[PDB]
C-alpha cells in the first residue's frame, strides 16, 4: 500500500527503477506483495539461508538432449463452426460430416475450473517455492492405508506430481516431480537455482526434481526412475497416444497380480507420475495453443483415452480425477449423437466409426441416459463381424475400432438396470462367436510378448465361461522360441480379465440367466432371437427341454437347455434328456439363408467347446459351407446347430 524505488549498481551504472504498488496491487488481483515479502525471510542471515539451500536434493545427472514437440492438435479444418464450451447451442453442428471444433479459450476454463493451492507450505516445498495458488486439476490416489499417497497437481502450464510415504511413525518422506515448459516453471524462492534441480531439459521443456537429501535417499530404496526415458515419452508423444501408453501399462498390470495388493516398486511409482502427465499433456496442449479452436475429431480421440484411463485408475487405486472434464464437450458430443443412425453406424467409414464411438462415450458418460448408443456399438460389431473372416484373429485395424465401441457397452453392464437388453445381448452373442480358438491363440501370444493384442479382445465381454487355466494352455502358441513362463503369465492374466465373479462385466444382466440353478457350471449361453440356450454341465437347468450330447466319459457332462422367449420352467424337466439328431440329408451349398438366426457350435469331446458361429447373413453362411470349416473326418469333433426352433442338431455329412 505504497510505492517503492529500487536503486542498484550495474557494473558502474547508478540505475534506479520505481515499482508502483498503487498500480500493480489493484491492476493484478492475485498480487499481494506483503505475503511475498513475508515468504522470503528477508532478514534471514546468510547462515540459515545457506542451511535451507543445502537440504534440497540437487541434480547430478542433469542433462537431456533436445527432443522435438509432436504436432498434436491439428489446424482448423477450413470453415469449422468454432464453438463455445459454455454456450453449447442446439443444432450448431449438423452432422458427423460437418467440420466442428470447440474454441480453446473457454474450454481451458472448463477443464481447469477447480482452484486450490499448487505449491503447498508443506515442509519440502515452502523452503524452495514462493507459494502459489492457481487454477488447477489433480490426479490423486492413496494406498497402503493412506500411508503412501501420490498427487498429480497440474495447471495449463506445468505439472507437479508429489509422492508421500509414512514410515509407520510420524515421519513423512516427500518427493515431487515438476514437469512443463522451461519458461512456465514456477517462481523460485530462496537462493535456489533451477538447473540444480533440473534432471532433463530439451528445447522448451524441463523436468525438475524437488526433495530433501534425506528424502531422496529414503525413496532411492524402491524408486529409481529412468528419468531420461520418462521425459522423452512425456515430450515426444502425442497427448492421445501418451494416454494409451499409460492405459496399456495399467490394463496389462490390472488383470495380472499387480494392483490388487500394489507393489511399491520403481515401475508402479513411475506409472503414477505418467498418469498425471497423460491428463496434463491434454490440458497443456489445449492451453498452450492460444486463442484458437481444437478440432473436435482430436477432442473425441484424446478425451476418449482419458475417459478409459479415468475408469481403470478408479479400479486399480482409490483414485480421483478432479478438473479435466468440460460439460461443454460432453453436451457437444451428445448432441452430435442425435445426428446419426445408430442402427446403421457400422455401414460408415473406418475413420467415421471411430470418431462416432468416441463421441458416444464422451457424450453421456455415466452410460444409461439414452440407451440407443448401445445399438450403435452393436452395429459396428455386426458390420465388422460379417466382413471379418470369422474365427480369425482380428487385425489391429478392426480390433482398435471394436475396442472403442466396447467401452459404451461395458458401462451398461456396470448398471443394475437393463437399459434395453436386446442390443446388449446381441453384442455379447457376436462377441461369443468371435471368441474362437485362434482369437485366444493370438491374444495369448500377444500377452506373452506384451503386444497390442494384450489390451482387448471381444472375448472379454462374451458369454463364454468354459475358460479356465487348463483350457487356455492347450490353445496357446506352440513355439519353443516363446518363454513358456510368459505363456503361463499370459494364461493367468487372461483368466484374471474374465473371472465370472468379482468382475461384474461378464454376467447378471440377461433375462434368461434366472433359469439356472448352479451358475458356476454353465459353460456358455447362446441368446438367439425367440430363444436362448444354456450350455452347461449342470443337469438341473430349468429350461424348455434338455439335450445331452454324446460327450465322453471324460468331461463332466454336456447339456443344452433351450429357454423359449426367456421364460423359465417351474422345475428342471425330469427323465432322460433328448438325443441330438444326426443329419446328412443336407446339401453343402445354399443360395438362401436357411441358417439365418441360428447358432453353430464346434466342440471337441475331451477339450470342450472350440468355436461358436452366429449365422447372421448370407455371406456368413456361404463363408461357412464353402470354407474348410466342416471336417467330419475328425470324429473327436462334432458340429451342433442351435435353432430358433429350440432344437439342437448335429451335422454329420454334406453332399
Amino acid at each position, epitope marked *: 500500500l505504497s510505492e517503492v524505488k529500487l536503486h542498484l549498481d550495474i557494473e558502474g551504472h547508478a540505475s534506479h527503477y520505481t515499482i508502483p504498488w498503487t498500480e500493480l496491487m489493484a491492476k493484478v488481483p492475485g498480487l499481494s506483495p506483503e505475503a511475498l515479502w513475508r515468504e522470503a525471510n528477508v532478514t534471514e542471515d546468510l547462515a540459515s539461508m545457506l542451511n535451507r539451500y543445502k537440504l534440497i536434493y540437487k541434480t547430478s545427472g542433469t542433462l537431456g538432449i533436445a527432443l522435438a514437440e509432436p504436432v498434436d*492438435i*491439428p*489446424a*482448423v*479444418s*477450413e*470453415g*469449422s*463452426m*468454432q*464453438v*463455445d464450451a*459454455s*454456450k453449447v*447451442h442446439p443444432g*450448431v453442428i449438423s452432422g458427423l460430416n460437418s467440420p466442428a*471444433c470447440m*474454441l*480453446s*479459450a*473457454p474450454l481451458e476454463k472448463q477443464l481447469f475450473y477447480y482452484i486450490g493451492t499448487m505449491l503447498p507450505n508443506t515442509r519440502p516445498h515452502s523452503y524452495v517455492f514462493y507459494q502459489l495458488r492457481c487454477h488447477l486439476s489433480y490426479v490423486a490416489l492413496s494406498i497402503n492405508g493412506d500411508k503412501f499417497q501420490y498427487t498429480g497437481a497440474m495447471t495449463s502450464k506445468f505439472l507437479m506430481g508429489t509422492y508421500k510415504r509414512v514410515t509407520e511413525k510420524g515421519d513423512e518422506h516427500v518427493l515431487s516431480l515438476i514437469f512443463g515448459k522451461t519458461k512456465d516453471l514456477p517462481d523460485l524462492r530462496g537462493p535456489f537455482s533451477y538447473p540444480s534441480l533440473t534432471s532433463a531439459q530439451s528445447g522448451d521443456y524441463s523436468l525438475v526434481i524437488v526433495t530433501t537429501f534425506v528424502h531422496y535417499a529414503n525413496f532411492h530404496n524402491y524408486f529409481v526412475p529412468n528419468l531420461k526415458d520418462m521425459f522423452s515419452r512425456a515430450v515426444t508423444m502425442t497427448a492421445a497416444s501418451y494416454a494409451r501408453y499409460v492405459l496399456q501399462k495399467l490394463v496389462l498390470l490390472e488383470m495380472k497380480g499387480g494392483c490388487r495388493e500394489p507393489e511399491l516398486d520403481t515401475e508402479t511409482l513411475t506409472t503414477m507420475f505418467e498418469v498425471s502427465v497423460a491428463f496434463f499433456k491434454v490440458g497443456h496442449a489445449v492451453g*498452450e*495453443t*492460444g*486463442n*484458437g*479452436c481444437v478440432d473436435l475429431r482430436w477432442l473425441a480421440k484424446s478425451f476418449f483415452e482419458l475417459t478409459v484411463l479415468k475408469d481403470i485408475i478408479g479400479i486399480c487405486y482409490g483414485a480421483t480425477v478432479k478438473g479435466m472434464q468440460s460439460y461443454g464437450l460432453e453436451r457437444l458430443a451428445a448432441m452430435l449423437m442425435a445426428t446419426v443412425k445408430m442402427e446403421e453406424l457400422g455401414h460408415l467409414t473406418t475413420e467415421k466409426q471411430e470418431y462416432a464411438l468416441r463421441l458416444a462415450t464422451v457424450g453421456y458418460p455415466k452410460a444409461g441416459v439414452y440407451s440407443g448408443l448401445i445399438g450403435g456399438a452393436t452395429s459396428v460389431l455386426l458390420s465388422a463381424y460379417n466382413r471379418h473372416p470369422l474365427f480369425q484373429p482380428l487385425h489391429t485395424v478392426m480390433r482398435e475400432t471394436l475396442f472403442i465401441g466396447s467401452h459404451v457397452v461395458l458401462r451398461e453392464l456396470r448398471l443394475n438396470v437393463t437399459t434395453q437388453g436386446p442390443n446388449l445381448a446381441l453384442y455379447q452373442l457376436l462377441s461369443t462367436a468371435l471368441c474362437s480358438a485362434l482369437e485366444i491363440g493370438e491374444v495369448l501370444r500377444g500377452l506373452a510378448l506384451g503386444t497390442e493384442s494384450g489390451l482387448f479382445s471381444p472375448c472379454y465381454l462374451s458369454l463364454r465361461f468354459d475358460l479356465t487355466r487348463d483350457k487356455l494352455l492347450s490353445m496357446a502358441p506352440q513355439e519353443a522360441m516363446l518363454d513358456q513362463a510368459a505363456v503361463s503369465n499370459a494364461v493367468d492374466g487372461f483368466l484374471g480379465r474374465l473371472s465370472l465373479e468379482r468382475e461384474d462385466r461378464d454376467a447378471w444382466h440377461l433375462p434368461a440367466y434366472k433359469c439356472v440353478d448352479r451358475l458356476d457350471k454353465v459353460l456358455m449361453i447362446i441368446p438367439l432371437i425367440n430363444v436362448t440356450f444354456i450350455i452347461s454341465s449342470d443337469r438341473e437347468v430349468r429350461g424348455s427341454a434338455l439335450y445331452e450330447a454324446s460327450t465322453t466319459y471324460l468331461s463332466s457332462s454336456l447339456f443344452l437347455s433351450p429357454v423359449i422367449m426367456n421364460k423359465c420352467s417351474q422345475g428342471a424337466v425330469a427323465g432322460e434328456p433328448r438325443q441330438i439328431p444326426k443329419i446328412q440329408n443336407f446339401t453343402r451349398t445354399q443360395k438362401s439363408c436357411i441358417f439365418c438366426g441360428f447358432a453353430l457350435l464346434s466342440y471337441d469331446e475331451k477339450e470342450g467347446l472350440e468355436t461358436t458361429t452366429y449365422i447372421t447373413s448370407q455371406e456368413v453362411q456361404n463363408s461357412i459351407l464353402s470354407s474348410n470349416y466342416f471336417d467330419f473326418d475328425n470324429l473327436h469333433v462334432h458340429y451342433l446347430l442351435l435353432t430358433t426352433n429350440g432344437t439342437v442338431m448335429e451335422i454329420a455329412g454334406l453332399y
Partner: T-cell receptor
Amino acid sequence: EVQLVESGGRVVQPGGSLRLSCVTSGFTFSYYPIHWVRQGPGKGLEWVTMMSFDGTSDHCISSVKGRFVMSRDNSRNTLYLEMNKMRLEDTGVYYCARGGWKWPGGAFDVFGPGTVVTVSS
Amino acid sequence: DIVMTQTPPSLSASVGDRVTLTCRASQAIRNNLAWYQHKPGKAPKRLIYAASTLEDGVPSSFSGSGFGTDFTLTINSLQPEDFATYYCLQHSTYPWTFGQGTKVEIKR
C-alpha cells in the same frame, strides 16, 4: 503479456512504396497467422489483408489486391508488409493482429499500437 | 463482399444505462462475428468473439448474442471508460468487413 508492435510508419508520395514491420513478442509466432486492419481519417476500421500461417498464400481485399505483398520470417518473429501504388484513400493508421491460432480459421485479438501512413506528396 | 450494417451510427446515454448495439449481415455468417472497442489514439480491444463469448479481461457487463443474420452487443451497465466507438466484425467469408461502427457519446 502478448505484445504486437508495428513500426513502419512514414510519409509516402502517392504511388510510391512503403514497407511495414509488425514485431510480435510474448507468444509462439509461427503457430499464428496475421491480419492487417486500417482506419482512415474520419472513417471506420477496414480489414485490409491476411497473412497465412505458411505465408505462401496472401489474400487481400479488392481495393488493395495485387498491390500488397506480405512476407513473414518466423525466426525474426516479424511480419513485413510491402505496399505498392499507394493511393490517397490508403492513407490512415494501420494495425496488425494475430488471427488463426493453429491457423486457418481466423479472428483478431488485441492489435498493436498502429503506425501512421500519410499518402500526400 | 458481405455488408455489415450496424445500427445506430451514433448513440448517447448516461453512466449506468443499458446500451444495446445492433449489427446485421447481408448473408448468413453463421456464428463468426466479433466486437471491438476502439478508443481514439490507442489500440482496439476485442470484446466478444463467437458473437457470444465474452473474452478474458473484459468486464462482464458486456454480452453478445445472435445467429446467422442479426447480432447484438449489449453493455448492461455503462461505465465512464466505456465511452468509445464500437465496431462489429464478420470473419465468415473473406474479404472480411467491419460495420461502420457505433460511437457511444455520453449524454448531456
